[PDB]
Amino acid sequence: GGVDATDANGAELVKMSYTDKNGKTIEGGYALKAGDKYYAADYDEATGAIK
Amino acid sequence: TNSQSDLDSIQAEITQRLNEIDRVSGQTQFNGVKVLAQDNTLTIQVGANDGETIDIDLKQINSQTLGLDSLNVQKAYDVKDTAVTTKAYAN
Lengths: 51, 91
Hints:
This is part of a larger assembly, with 2 copies of chain A.
Chain A: H1 5-10, E1 13-19, E2 25-32
Antiparallel strand pairs in A: 1-2
Protein name (chain B): Flagellin
Function (chain B): Flagellin is the subunit protein which polymerizes to form the filaments of bacterial flagella.
Subcellular location (chain B): Secreted; Bacterial flagellum
């Protein structure tokens, strides 16, 4: 789907949390941090499936 | 005339009032906008024209901007240190 294989192998799952200018942080979905790009990947509580 | 046990209570009141004016300006908001926490310009689009902005203005008013982070009316105390121990009948 994106970037390159070397960078893709490197990325590990992280939970995104956006912060405004004001100060309250909004929580977002899961993502796959490939390189420094963010991938809209979904993590299932059961097992370890990362879709 | 006021004793130092008086000045302790007056300082307790003064620090609670200053914590309160730090809180009520730190976390107050109209539509998620902290009005007194930080200094910036709010521009109002008051006209159909592009430059019709009336800008409201702010000053950080916390305890450091007002300059009330240090307020001691507590005078001074003299502390004496006396050693504490447990005796022994070992002679």
